[PDB]
Symmetry: D2
Subunit: 261 residues, 4 copies
């Protein structure tokens, strides 16, 4: 079937890429980056994130595969030494499909509205000065946050930025999103919950401005300034990312190999 | 068929009599606790063996609770609604705790394991696979509704009770070279089993909600999301996040 | 004696400043914004920081005073209504001086030459763009390889500021120290970090050395500027201290209490 | 001169103890268990703590030495392979002294006084733990949780670290208060951040309802009936260590929490 391979850009990934593509020269596999049915990323989780957003329009017809030329990643969990075995197993078709939840981020202005999908997380920070927003949960005011910013994470994203912010780790089979605080000043004037908050499906977390209406909104690796922001809504997306499962690599093992060892 | 449990004070017992006027203590379909969350926990453990046939209602004679959701003065209209049978049931996940014949426990809030005198050292096994060797005060495994309790004080995350899961938090982990721990709270879905296996000392203080019993000769402690759920009789709409807001945000 | 007054800029602070200047004119006082012996800040902590750095070359000959026109600040102790008595007590010279420690920040490059900075609150180091990875070297000895958003080194009086939000401990400003806090460390097996905040005494030097990227966004009391081709960033408790004119007794722990607990 | 050796109690520590005693017999070393000038601890930090409390009445004339028979300890930083060198180094008399601060714990109900090398904690003797935290004779907060931990500087790497407290170099004469599983709701508002107090600062813990508190000192956990006040302050007493080679505190922190590549 149709496939394509993205590379980190360094000699390790570029050479491994060409070596794998040559491997598909012995099987009924056509190279196509317009409408691929299988996308292989080579490099790191960051590289994998670029590959996700490169085809966030064809998520339902694409099985992603991650290969790390450096250290182990939670998305790039295949070693380059197993690149040969992957090609053969992929060319045959003996693989299952695993799906992870995604984060929907909607931004309203005072035009229209913009929506974004995140595989890891979405963060909102200030355009320079102090970051002050109201946190509205299901059309109900919850807290007035003051600090550096807020981070809404996917379940698979919990092991990334979320973890460094003291967030909890969630098994990606759990369809949910997690909100963590970034350097919250927690005084009497600005009282926040402190604890990370985990939200289920169909729950909407709305971030509404108080004074300044310009915000730095990041989606995974990408980050851009949004001016005249009226509202920033978070909810678990109805869209999912599909992985190609060849072997059995448990989420918790992957957590163990990263942080415990 | 219904029944009413009281805290023990004069106000709760009086309200119990004042509500009983508007009864099966063996085969109940409606259990009404009068007191607080702690009192509610007692009513839960009194009927663990028929949770699929019982809806619970909490009345807080003191401060607002996460289980006791009704005000004392609102007991007048509560009877007329619980008699018509016009109510929908809300289900919360529970935590199963097996100790190893073997003893199994059900918790509405959380279950914790600490050493009965001395250092607490345990191997954390996740799905038959070693994850970390823990050394410290202990570990806490919390239900979603229990996250607002001890879990929160231990730095755990708050999660909505509609999410079927359990959350593991640390209790003063030393987290060094010998005993490297994850630090982060861990949230496990259904059918995931966390196993605690001793290294030397096999005597542990195991607590289930309000009950803290001492266990000797422990070989394994298994944690997983129970197949049973607790049902609440719902009349009005009280959002979980509102209860969280009212409790901590003020 | 010689003095000057800085203002937040709003109508309130500007008005109070003019009235204090006229008040001072009734005594043996002279306005001098070049070589003052007393510097008065009217506004908030942020206003106080600007005044601090405006005269950081004369910290040895200046006694600072802070007046908060809004909410109570850790540096701005005095209320606007007390400005009257404050003028009189200043003119008589009826006050003692209290000193807080400062943080020295040295930036070395590859050879332009060298740059040093004094901090009243804290000094942070983050990346210019991309992963922030540095080697933390304590007194010439390697301690950890840090990956994350950045690192924050706080003065004692700075511990109630950014340091606190980052989980740092609150430290009484009579203690001559500096506290290093992590900013979202990844803390995995490759980049294992201590996690805990570190409190260093005087003469202890913390060296942040680049692993790959030599460009860093360095901030000193929210004065964040881009430093390129950085070879080393050294942290140590300065020998210079900021001096406060003391009249009444406003305990540090009460300032903390009134600001975070209840007032 | 006069020396003594305490052992962990196991086969390895008992043997090493006898081995050193035999070695000292070759030099001018007198073994005395009631009036030693140098106390050697063989085992772990726990064994070191017992040795401290065993001779806490004569801290003025005793220099302590720790040997860890297991993993590296913060007090027991000598390894068994270096035992031969220690005996010779002790007999030679060539060593300087290093002093660490201690925590004074006063319990008022007649007045009970305790000294802590690591820390002192106050938990509940059953039921909710609710106390009023008073700093220098003024209310600071009302705490509710599992308990509170007051740590020495050298104690910060112990229980204090696990509770999220900051690591502090023992050259700093201070004490650090950390919260143990606090409840932060609409009723009980605490500072959250660990607090570092200098000398001459008193932290008083006063009961709200329950007067029975489980007080621990380094690990002598004792139930105290009818408590009116628990006072915390930096002691004037200090523990003295015998120094021969350079083994930095931060190195000990590094080798214990980060990594130890040569072991
Ligand atoms: N999250 C913080 N919580 C407490 N205090 C902070 C924080 N952040 C900062 S400055 C770093 C920064 O850019 N933070 C993001 C925007 C922000 C957010 C809140 C307050 C000021 C600025 N300071 C203090 O602000 C002083 C600047 O006037 C600095 O010295 C920091 O101590
Ligand atoms: N401290 C973090 N610990 C774990 N993971 C993080 C972190 N920070 C980030 S992105 C936030 C950021 O720009 N931080 C400035 C320094 C930095 C550090 C790492 C990667 C990129 C940039 N991600 C993950 O990086 C992914 C982009 O490749 C994002 O999706 C975050 O999950
Ligand atoms: N979690 C702790 N992490 C580091 N260190 C601790 C801790 N806990 C303690 S004592 C508190 C206690 O009894 N905890 C029960 C479980 C436990 C677990 C490990 C070690 C001792 C005890 N200390 C240190 O134990 C020393 C006694 O040998 C005390 O001085 C504490 O510093
Ligand atoms: N630090 C904690 N913050 C929040 N909640 C806690 C904590 N600790 C506990 S149990 C351990 C302990 O020492 N608790 C004293 C507080 C308490 C609270 C309610 C009822 C009895 C006692 N729980 C909850 O107490 C419930 C018993 O009613 C248990 O289910 C814990 O979740």
């Amino acid at each position: 079937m149709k496939y394509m391979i993205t590379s980190k850009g360094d000699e390790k990934s570029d050479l491994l890429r060409l070596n794998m593509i040559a491997g598909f020269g012995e099987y009924d596999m056509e190279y196509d980056d317009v409408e691929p049915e299988i996308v292989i990323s080579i490099g790191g989780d960051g590289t994998f994130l670029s590959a996700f957003h490169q085809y966030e329009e064809r998520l339902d017809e694409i099985a992603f595969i991650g290969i790390h030329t450096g250290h182990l990643g939670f998305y790039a969990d295949w070693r380059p030494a197993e690149a040969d075995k992957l090609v053969k197993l992929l060319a045959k078709g003996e693989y299952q499909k695993v799906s992870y939840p995604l984060l929907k981020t909607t931004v309203k202005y005072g035009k229209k509205e913009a929506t974004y999908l995140a595989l890891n997380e979405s963060t909102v920070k200030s355009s320079g000065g102090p970051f002050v927003v109201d946190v509205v949960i299901n059309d109900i005011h919850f807290e007035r946050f003051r600090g550096d910013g807020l981070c809404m994470s996917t379940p698979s994203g919990t092991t990334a930025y979320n973890k460094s912010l003291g967030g909890a780790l969630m098994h990606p089979s759990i369809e949910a999103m997690q909100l963590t605080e970034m350097a919250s000043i927690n005084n009497r004037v600005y009282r926040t919950i402190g604890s990370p908050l985990v939200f289920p499906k169909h729950h909407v977390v709305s971030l509404q401005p108080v004074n300044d209406k310009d915000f730095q909104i990041s989606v995974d690796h990408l980050s851009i300034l949004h001016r005249d922001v009226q509202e920033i809504r978070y909810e678990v997306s109805a869209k999912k990312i599909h992985f190609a499962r060849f072997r059995s690599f448990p989420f918790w093992r992957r957590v163990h190999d990263s942080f415990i060892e």
